[PDB]
Amino acid sequence: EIVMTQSPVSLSVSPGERATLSCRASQGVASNLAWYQQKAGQAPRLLIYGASTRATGIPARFSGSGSGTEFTLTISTLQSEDSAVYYCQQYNDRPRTFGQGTKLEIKRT
Amino acid sequence: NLCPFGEVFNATRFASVYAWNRKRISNCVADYSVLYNSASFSTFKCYGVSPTKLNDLCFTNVYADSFVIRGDEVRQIAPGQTGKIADYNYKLPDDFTGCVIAWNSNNLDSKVGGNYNYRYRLFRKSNLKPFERDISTEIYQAGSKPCNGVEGFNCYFPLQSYGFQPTNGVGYQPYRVVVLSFEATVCG
Amino acid sequence: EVQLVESGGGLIQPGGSLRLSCAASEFIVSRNYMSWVRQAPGTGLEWVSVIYPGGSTFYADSVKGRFTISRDNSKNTLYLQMDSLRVEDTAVYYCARDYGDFYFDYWGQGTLVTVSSAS
């Protein structure tokens, strides 16, 4: 099955720097990759389906892109509420396999 | 006379898998080893009768059933299979006499940027009966609300469109599939 | 009002049985692609099962044979018959409505299952 590798395994970004998160694939998934955001003590809310579509209530700050085997998630303005763990899965082959998740944290003083 | 397999296996435009094309083959002599020996087909396995020995047998009528699926789910065109295509697009009975031809059509049915014409039924209320055809583009009721023909949350169009590329994988490439059925007019 | 309330998780013996639940609201389980996803600490978030509208049951290779998804249609209640449990099933189990058999669009709050030798 497809093994997703979120490369920035932990990324600490100042509140507003346009953080960028990525995951590659062991095979080819055409536009077929989703993104999930799991905050602390919560179910992972869906962010982006089909690698480019913000679903429902997801603002324009999340700007995921990429296709084939290289994928990108771009968090734009980085409030304090964006500190979560960001996953990616594939659609194309069964089973649907998640990534290891990117733990994104915001910086204060 | 020869049975017209020529515009079944070499039609310029097949149909989608939810709207699978069906032609009736009647009152002709059919050659099947011209189909068998061609080797342009990646998938040709026969259930109920061997491909070498079904040239010598006769049926009243024969249905040629043609559509286009992604190359991963040619496995689902078989007796007793489950999936989206085997349950909501094209179901074969368990007592299937007949057989299935599938060949790659990446060079024809897939264009640069996406040949989005081919669609499959994604949402359906129940499994299909064998050899049942559904067209209906009524808005699916995922929830409990009058959708009234307009989409939105929990009101989905039931037809997902195939996305075909010349660069993606072999199993994600468009496979044309012809399914033959057997039921005395059509002999060898 | 979109909810997916999950119950039935808890401590059970290793080598026991569980009958989880997911009481939906505002969408019917019987006609939606519903799925179970487990989140185990230390490993990744991992897909378990899926059920199609009316449809059929598909399972992961680590859960195949021992697990069983079985919805009910009198009330919106997605179950997960969870038999012959081993200690590598210590995970938070989420019921999750899918769009297609593609993506887990909405998720329930999850219920945690512990399978070990304690009281």
Side-chain angles (χ1 to χ4, degrees), chain B residues 82-84 87-88 120 122-125 127 140-145 153-154 156 160, chain C residues 2 26-28 31-33 52-56 58 97-102 105-106:
Chain B
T82 45
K84 293 165 182 160
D87 292 331
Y88 312 125
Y120 61 99
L122 172 63
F123 291 106
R124 203 188 190 277
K125 276 102 171 163
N127 279 3
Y140 187 79
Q141 264 292 334
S144 76
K145 204 182 211 63
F153 177 64
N154 290 356
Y156 308 131
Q160 192 56 253
Chain C
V2 173
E26 195 40 32
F27 47 85
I28 297 89
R31 54 192 301 141
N32 284 256
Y33 286 82
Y52 289 1
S56 55
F58 296 118
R97 194 218 76 169
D98 310 346
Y99 175 92
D101 170 19
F102 311 131
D105 189 359
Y106 292 81

CSV table of all heavy atoms in Angstrom, one decimal, chain B residues 82-84 87-88 120 122-125 127 140-145 153-154 156 160, chain C residues 2 26-28 31-33 52-56 58 97-102 105-106:
chain,number,residue,atom,x,y,z
B,82,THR,N,-18.1,-7.6,-5.4
B,82,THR,CA,-18.7,-6.4,-4.8
B,82,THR,C,-17.8,-5.2,-5.0
B,82,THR,O,-16.6,-5.4,-5.2
B,82,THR,CB,-18.9,-6.6,-3.3
B,82,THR,OG1,-17.7,-7.2,-2.7
B,82,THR,CG2,-20.1,-7.5,-3.0
B,83,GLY,N,-18.4,-4.0,-5.0
B,83,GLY,CA,-17.7,-2.8,-5.3
B,83,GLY,C,-18.7,-1.8,-5.8
B,83,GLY,O,-19.9,-2.0,-5.7
B,84,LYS,N,-18.2,-0.7,-6.3
B,84,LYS,CA,-19.1,0.4,-6.8
B,84,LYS,C,-19.6,-0.1,-8.1
B,84,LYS,O,-20.9,0.0,-8.4
B,84,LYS,CB,-18.3,1.7,-7.0
B,84,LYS,CG,-17.9,2.3,-5.6
B,84,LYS,CD,-16.9,3.3,-5.8
B,84,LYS,CE,-16.5,3.9,-4.5
B,84,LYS,NZ,-15.2,4.6,-4.6
B,87,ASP,N,-21.9,-3.3,-8.0
B,87,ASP,CA,-23.2,-3.2,-7.3
B,87,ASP,C,-24.1,-2.1,-7.7
B,87,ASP,O,-25.3,-2.2,-7.5
B,87,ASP,CB,-22.9,-3.0,-5.8
B,87,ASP,CG,-22.3,-4.2,-5.1
B,87,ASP,OD1,-22.5,-5.3,-5.6
B,87,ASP,OD2,-21.5,-4.0,-4.1
B,88,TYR,N,-23.5,-1.0,-8.3
B,88,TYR,CA,-24.3,0.1,-8.7
B,88,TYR,C,-24.2,0.5,-10.2
B,88,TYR,O,-24.9,1.4,-10.6
B,88,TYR,CB,-23.9,1.4,-7.9
B,88,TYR,CG,-23.8,1.1,-6.4
B,88,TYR,CD1,-22.6,1.3,-5.7
B,88,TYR,CD2,-24.8,0.5,-5.7
B,88,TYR,CE1,-22.5,1.0,-4.4
B,88,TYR,CE2,-24.7,0.2,-4.4
B,88,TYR,CZ,-23.6,0.5,-3.7
B,88,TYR,OH,-23.5,0.2,-2.4
B,120,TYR,N,-19.4,6.9,-13.6
B,120,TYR,CA,-19.9,5.7,-12.9
B,120,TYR,C,-20.9,6.1,-11.8
B,120,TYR,O,-20.8,7.2,-11.3
B,120,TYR,CB,-18.8,4.9,-12.3
B,120,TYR,CG,-17.9,5.5,-11.3
B,120,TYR,CD1,-18.1,5.2,-10.0
B,120,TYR,CD2,-16.8,6.3,-11.7
B,120,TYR,CE1,-17.2,5.8,-9.0
B,120,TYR,CE2,-16.0,6.8,-10.7
B,120,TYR,CZ,-16.2,6.6,-9.4
B,120,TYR,OH,-15.4,7.1,-8.5
B,122,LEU,N,-22.0,6.4,-8.3
B,122,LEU,CA,-21.3,6.4,-7.0
B,122,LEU,C,-22.3,6.2,-5.9
B,122,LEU,O,-22.0,5.4,-5.0
B,122,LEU,CB,-20.6,7.7,-6.9
B,122,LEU,CG,-20.0,8.0,-5.5
B,122,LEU,CD1,-18.9,7.0,-5.3
B,122,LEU,CD2,-19.4,9.4,-5.5
B,123,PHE,N,-23.4,6.9,-5.9
B,123,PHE,CA,-24.4,6.7,-4.8
B,123,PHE,C,-25.6,6.0,-5.4
B,123,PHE,O,-26.2,6.4,-6.4
B,123,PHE,CB,-24.8,8.1,-4.3
B,123,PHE,CG,-23.7,8.8,-3.5
B,123,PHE,CD1,-23.1,9.8,-4.0
B,123,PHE,CD2,-23.4,8.3,-2.2
B,123,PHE,CE1,-22.1,10.5,-3.3
B,123,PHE,CE2,-22.4,8.9,-1.5
B,123,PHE,CZ,-21.7,10.0,-2.1
B,124,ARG,N,-26.1,4.9,-4.7
B,124,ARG,CA,-27.3,4.3,-5.1
B,124,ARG,C,-27.9,3.7,-3.8
B,124,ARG,O,-27.2,3.3,-2.9
B,124,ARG,CB,-27.1,3.2,-6.1
B,124,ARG,CG,-28.3,2.9,-6.9
B,124,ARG,CD,-28.2,1.7,-7.8
B,124,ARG,NE,-29.3,1.6,-8.8
B,124,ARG,CZ,-30.5,1.0,-8.4
B,124,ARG,NH1,-30.6,0.5,-7.2
B,124,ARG,NH2,-31.4,1.0,-9.3
B,125,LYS,N,-29.2,3.6,-3.8
B,125,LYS,CA,-29.9,3.2,-2.6
B,125,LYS,C,-29.8,1.8,-2.3
B,125,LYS,O,-29.8,1.4,-1.1
B,125,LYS,CB,-31.4,3.5,-2.7
B,125,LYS,CG,-31.8,5.0,-2.4
B,125,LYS,CD,-32.0,5.7,-3.7
B,125,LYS,CE,-32.6,7.1,-3.5
B,125,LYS,NZ,-32.4,8.0,-4.6
B,127,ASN,N,-28.2,-2.4,-4.0
B,127,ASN,CA,-27.4,-3.1,-5.0
B,127,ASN,C,-28.2,-3.4,-6.2
B,127,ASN,O,-29.5,-3.5,-6.2
B,127,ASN,CB,-26.9,-4.4,-4.4
B,127,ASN,CG,-25.7,-4.3,-3.5
B,127,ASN,OD1,-25.2,-3.2,-3.3
B,127,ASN,ND2,-25.2,-5.4,-3.0
B,140,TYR,N,-29.3,12.4,-5.1
B,140,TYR,CA,-29.3,11.4,-4.1
B,140,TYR,C,-29.6,12.0,-2.7
B,140,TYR,O,-29.2,13.1,-2.4
B,140,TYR,CB,-27.9,10.7,-4.1
B,140,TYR,CG,-27.9,9.5,-3.2
B,140,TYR,CD1,-28.4,8.2,-3.5
B,140,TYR,CD2,-27.2,9.6,-1.9
B,140,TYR,CE1,-28.3,7.2,-2.7
B,140,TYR,CE2,-27.1,8.5,-1.1
B,140,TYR,CZ,-27.7,7.3,-1.5
B,140,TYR,OH,-27.6,6.2,-0.6
B,141,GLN,N,-30.3,11.2,-1.9
B,141,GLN,CA,-30.7,11.6,-0.6
B,141,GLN,C,-29.7,11.0,0.5
B,141,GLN,O,-30.0,9.9,1.0
B,141,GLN,CB,-32.1,11.2,-0.3
B,141,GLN,CG,-33.1,12.3,-0.6
B,141,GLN,CD,-33.0,13.4,0.4
B,141,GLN,OE1,-32.6,13.3,1.5
B,141,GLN,NE2,-33.5,14.6,-0.1
B,142,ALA,N,-28.6,11.7,0.7
B,142,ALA,CA,-27.7,11.2,1.7
B,142,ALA,C,-28.3,11.4,3.1
B,142,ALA,O,-27.9,10.7,4.0
B,142,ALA,CB,-26.4,11.9,1.6
B,143,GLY,N,-29.1,12.4,3.3
B,143,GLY,CA,-29.7,12.8,4.6
B,143,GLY,C,-31.2,12.6,4.6
B,143,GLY,O,-31.8,11.8,3.9
B,144,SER,N,-31.8,13.4,5.5
B,144,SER,CA,-33.2,13.4,5.8
B,144,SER,C,-33.7,14.8,5.6
B,144,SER,O,-33.8,15.5,6.6
B,144,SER,CB,-33.6,12.8,7.1
B,144,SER,OG,-33.3,13.7,8.1
B,145,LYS,N,-34.0,15.2,4.4
B,145,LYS,CA,-34.3,16.6,4.0
B,145,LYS,C,-34.8,16.6,2.6
B,145,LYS,O,-34.3,15.8,1.8
B,145,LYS,CB,-33.1,17.5,4.1
B,145,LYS,CG,-33.3,19.0,4.4
B,145,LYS,CD,-32.1,19.8,4.4
B,145,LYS,CE,-32.2,21.0,5.3
B,145,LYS,NZ,-32.4,20.6,6.7
B,153,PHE,N,-25.4,20.3,0.8
B,153,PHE,CA,-25.0,19.3,1.9
B,153,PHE,C,-25.9,18.2,1.9
B,153,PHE,O,-27.2,18.4,2.0
B,153,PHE,CB,-24.9,20.1,3.2
B,153,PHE,CG,-24.5,19.2,4.4
B,153,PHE,CD1,-23.3,18.6,4.4
B,153,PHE,CD2,-25.4,19.0,5.4
B,153,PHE,CE1,-23.0,17.7,5.5
B,153,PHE,CE2,-25.1,18.2,6.4
B,153,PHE,CZ,-23.9,17.5,6.5
B,154,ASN,N,-25.4,17.0,1.9
B,154,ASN,CA,-26.2,15.7,1.9
B,154,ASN,C,-27.2,15.6,0.8
B,154,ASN,O,-28.2,14.9,0.9
B,154,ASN,CB,-26.9,15.5,3.3
B,154,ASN,CG,-25.9,15.2,4.4
B,154,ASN,OD1,-24.7,15.1,4.1
B,154,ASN,ND2,-26.4,15.1,5.6
B,156,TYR,N,-26.4,14.8,-3.1
B,156,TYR,CA,-25.3,14.6,-4.1
B,156,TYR,C,-25.8,14.2,-5.4
B,156,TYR,O,-26.7,13.4,-5.5
B,156,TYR,CB,-24.3,13.6,-3.5
B,156,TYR,CG,-23.8,14.0,-2.1
B,156,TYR,CD1,-23.8,13.0,-1.1
B,156,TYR,CD2,-23.4,15.2,-1.8
B,156,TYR,CE1,-23.4,13.3,0.1
B,156,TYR,CE2,-23.0,15.6,-0.5
B,156,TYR,CZ,-23.0,14.6,0.4
B,156,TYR,OH,-22.6,14.9,1.7
B,160,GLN,N,-20.3,9.9,-10.2
B,160,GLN,CA,-19.0,10.4,-10.2
B,160,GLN,C,-18.3,10.2,-11.5
B,160,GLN,O,-18.6,9.2,-12.2
B,160,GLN,CB,-18.2,9.6,-9.1
B,160,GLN,CG,-16.8,10.2,-8.8
B,160,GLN,CD,-16.9,11.6,-8.4
B,160,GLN,OE1,-16.6,12.5,-9.1
B,160,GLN,NE2,-17.4,11.8,-7.2
C,2,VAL,N,-25.7,18.0,12.8
C,2,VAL,CA,-25.0,16.9,12.3
C,2,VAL,C,-24.2,16.3,13.5
C,2,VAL,O,-23.3,16.9,14.0
C,2,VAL,CB,-24.0,17.2,11.2
C,2,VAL,CG1,-23.1,16.1,10.8
C,2,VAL,CG2,-24.8,17.7,10.0
C,26,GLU,N,-29.3,13.3,11.2
C,26,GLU,CA,-29.5,14.2,10.0
C,26,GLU,C,-29.0,13.5,8.7
C,26,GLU,O,-29.3,14.0,7.6
C,26,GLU,CB,-28.9,15.6,10.2
C,26,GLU,CG,-29.3,16.7,9.2
C,26,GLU,CD,-30.8,16.8,8.8
C,26,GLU,OE1,-31.7,16.5,9.6
C,26,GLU,OE2,-31.0,17.3,7.7
C,27,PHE,N,-28.3,12.4,8.8
C,27,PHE,CA,-28.1,11.5,7.7
C,27,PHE,C,-28.3,10.1,8.1
C,27,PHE,O,-27.9,9.7,9.2
C,27,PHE,CB,-26.8,11.7,7.0
C,27,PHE,CG,-25.6,11.8,7.9
C,27,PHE,CD1,-25.0,10.6,8.3
C,27,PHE,CD2,-25.1,13.0,8.3
C,27,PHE,CE1,-23.9,10.7,9.1
C,27,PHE,CE2,-24.0,13.1,9.1
C,27,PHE,CZ,-23.4,11.9,9.5
C,28,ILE,N,-28.9,9.3,7.2
C,28,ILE,CA,-29.2,7.9,7.6
C,28,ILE,C,-28.0,7.1,7.3
C,28,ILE,O,-27.3,7.2,6.3
C,28,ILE,CB,-30.4,7.5,6.7
C,28,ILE,CG1,-31.7,8.2,7.0
C,28,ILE,CG2,-30.7,6.0,6.9
C,28,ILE,CD1,-32.0,9.5,6.2
C,31,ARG,N,-27.9,4.5,4.1
C,31,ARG,CA,-27.8,4.9,2.7
C,31,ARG,C,-26.6,5.8,2.5
C,31,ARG,O,-26.5,6.4,1.4
C,31,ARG,CB,-29.1,5.6,2.3
C,31,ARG,CG,-29.4,6.8,3.2
C,31,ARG,CD,-30.8,7.2,3.0
C,31,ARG,NE,-31.0,7.7,1.6
C,31,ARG,CZ,-32.1,7.5,0.9
C,31,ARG,NH1,-33.1,6.8,1.5
C,31,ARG,NH2,-32.2,7.9,-0.3
C,32,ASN,N,-25.7,5.9,3.5
C,32,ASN,CA,-24.5,6.6,3.4
C,32,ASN,C,-23.3,5.6,3.5
C,32,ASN,O,-23.4,4.6,4.2
C,32,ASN,CB,-24.3,7.7,4.4
C,32,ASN,CG,-25.2,8.9,4.1
C,32,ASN,OD1,-24.7,9.9,3.7
C,32,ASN,ND2,-26.5,8.8,4.3
C,33,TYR,N,-22.2,6.0,2.9
C,33,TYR,CA,-20.9,5.2,3.0
C,33,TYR,C,-20.4,5.5,4.4
C,33,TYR,O,-19.8,6.6,4.6
C,33,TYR,CB,-19.9,5.7,2.0
C,33,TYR,CG,-20.2,5.3,0.6
C,33,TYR,CD1,-21.0,6.0,-0.3
C,33,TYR,CD2,-19.5,4.2,0.0
C,33,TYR,CE1,-21.2,5.6,-1.6
C,33,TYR,CE2,-19.7,3.8,-1.3
C,33,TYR,CZ,-20.5,4.5,-2.1
C,33,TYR,OH,-20.7,4.2,-3.4
C,52,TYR,N,-21.0,0.1,2.5
C,52,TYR,CA,-21.6,0.9,1.4
C,52,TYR,C,-23.1,1.1,1.6
C,52,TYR,O,-23.7,0.5,2.5
C,52,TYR,CB,-21.3,0.2,0.0
C,52,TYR,CG,-19.9,0.2,-0.5
C,52,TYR,CD1,-18.9,0.8,0.2
C,52,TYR,CD2,-19.6,-0.4,-1.7
C,52,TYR,CE1,-17.6,0.8,-0.3
C,52,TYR,CE2,-18.3,-0.4,-2.2
C,52,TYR,CZ,-17.3,0.2,-1.5
C,52,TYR,OH,-16.1,0.2,-2.0
C,53,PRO,N,-23.8,2.0,0.8
C,53,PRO,CA,-25.2,2.1,1.0
C,53,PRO,C,-26.0,0.8,0.6
C,53,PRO,O,-26.0,0.5,-0.6
C,53,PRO,CB,-25.6,3.2,0.0
C,53,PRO,CG,-24.3,3.9,-0.4
C,53,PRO,CD,-23.2,3.2,0.3
C,54,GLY,N,-26.5,0.2,1.6
C,54,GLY,CA,-27.0,-1.2,1.5
C,54,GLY,C,-25.8,-2.1,1.3
C,54,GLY,O,-25.4,-2.8,2.3
C,55,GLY,N,-25.3,-2.1,0.1
C,55,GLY,CA,-23.9,-2.5,-0.2
C,55,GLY,C,-23.2,-3.6,0.5
C,55,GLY,O,-23.8,-4.6,0.8
C,56,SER,N,-21.9,-3.3,0.8
C,56,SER,CA,-21.1,-4.4,1.2
C,56,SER,C,-20.0,-4.0,2.2
C,56,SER,O,-19.9,-2.8,2.5
C,56,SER,CB,-20.4,-5.0,-0.1
C,56,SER,OG,-19.7,-3.9,-0.8
C,58,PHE,N,-16.1,-4.0,3.6
C,58,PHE,CA,-14.7,-4.1,3.3
C,58,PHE,C,-13.8,-3.8,4.5
C,58,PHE,O,-14.1,-2.9,5.2
C,58,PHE,CB,-14.3,-3.3,2.1
C,58,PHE,CG,-15.0,-3.6,0.8
C,58,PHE,CD1,-15.9,-2.8,0.2
C,58,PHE,CD2,-14.9,-4.9,0.3
C,58,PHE,CE1,-16.6,-3.1,-0.9
C,58,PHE,CE2,-15.6,-5.2,-0.9
C,58,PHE,CZ,-16.4,-4.3,-1.4
C,97,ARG,N,-18.6,9.3,8.4
C,97,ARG,CA,-19.4,9.2,7.2
C,97,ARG,C,-18.5,9.6,6.0
C,97,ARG,O,-17.7,10.6,6.1
C,97,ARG,CB,-20.5,10.2,7.2
C,97,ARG,CG,-21.5,10.0,6.1
C,97,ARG,CD,-22.1,11.3,5.6
C,97,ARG,NE,-21.1,12.0,4.7
C,97,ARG,CZ,-21.4,13.0,4.0
C,97,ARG,NH1,-22.6,13.5,4.0
C,97,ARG,NH2,-20.5,13.6,3.2
C,98,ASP,N,-18.5,8.8,4.9
C,98,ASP,CA,-17.7,9.1,3.8
C,98,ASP,C,-18.5,9.7,2.7
C,98,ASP,O,-19.7,9.5,2.6
C,98,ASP,CB,-17.0,7.9,3.3
C,98,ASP,CG,-16.3,7.1,4.3
C,98,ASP,OD1,-16.1,7.6,5.4
C,98,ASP,OD2,-15.9,5.9,4.0
C,99,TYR,N,-17.8,10.4,1.8
C,99,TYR,CA,-18.4,10.8,0.5
C,99,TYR,C,-17.7,9.9,-0.5
C,99,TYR,O,-16.5,9.9,-0.7
C,99,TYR,CB,-18.1,12.3,0.2
C,99,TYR,CG,-18.5,12.7,-1.2
C,99,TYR,CD1,-19.8,13.3,-1.4
C,99,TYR,CD2,-17.7,12.6,-2.3
C,99,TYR,CE1,-20.2,13.7,-2.7
C,99,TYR,CE2,-18.1,13.0,-3.6
C,99,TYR,CZ,-19.3,13.5,-3.7
C,99,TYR,OH,-19.7,13.9,-5.0
C,100,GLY,N,-18.6,9.0,-1.1
C,100,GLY,CA,-18.0,7.9,-1.8
C,100,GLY,C,-17.3,6.9,-0.9
C,100,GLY,O,-17.6,6.9,0.3
C,101,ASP,N,-16.4,6.2,-1.4
C,101,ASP,CA,-15.5,5.4,-0.6
C,101,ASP,C,-14.2,6.2,-0.7
C,101,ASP,O,-13.1,5.6,-0.9
C,101,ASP,CB,-15.5,3.9,-1.0
C,101,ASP,CG,-14.4,3.1,-0.4
C,101,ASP,OD1,-13.8,3.4,0.7
C,101,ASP,OD2,-14.2,1.9,-0.9
C,102,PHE,N,-14.3,7.5,-0.6
C,102,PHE,CA,-13.1,8.3,-0.8
C,102,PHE,C,-12.6,8.9,0.5
C,102,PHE,O,-11.5,8.6,0.9
C,102,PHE,CB,-13.5,9.5,-1.8
C,102,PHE,CG,-14.1,9.0,-3.1
C,102,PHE,CD1,-15.3,9.5,-3.6
C,102,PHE,CD2,-13.5,8.0,-3.8
C,102,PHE,CE1,-15.8,9.1,-4.7
C,102,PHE,CE2,-14.0,7.6,-5.0
C,102,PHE,CZ,-15.2,8.1,-5.4
C,105,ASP,N,-15.6,12.6,5.5
C,105,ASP,CA,-16.0,13.9,5.5
C,105,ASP,C,-16.4,14.5,6.8
C,105,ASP,O,-15.9,15.5,7.2
C,105,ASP,CB,-17.3,14.0,4.5
C,105,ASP,CG,-17.7,15.5,4.2
C,105,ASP,OD1,-17.0,16.4,4.7
C,105,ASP,OD2,-18.6,15.6,3.4
C,106,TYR,N,-17.1,13.7,7.6
C,106,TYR,CA,-17.5,14.1,9.0
C,106,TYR,C,-17.2,12.9,9.9
C,106,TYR,O,-17.3,11.7,9.5
C,106,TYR,CB,-18.9,14.5,9.1
C,106,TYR,CG,-19.3,15.8,8.4
C,106,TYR,CD1,-19.5,15.9,7.1
C,106,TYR,CD2,-19.3,17.0,9.2
C,106,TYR,CE1,-19.8,17.1,6.4
C,106,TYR,CE2,-19.6,18.2,8.5
C,106,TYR,CZ,-19.8,18.2,7.2
C,106,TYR,OH,-20.1,19.4,6.6
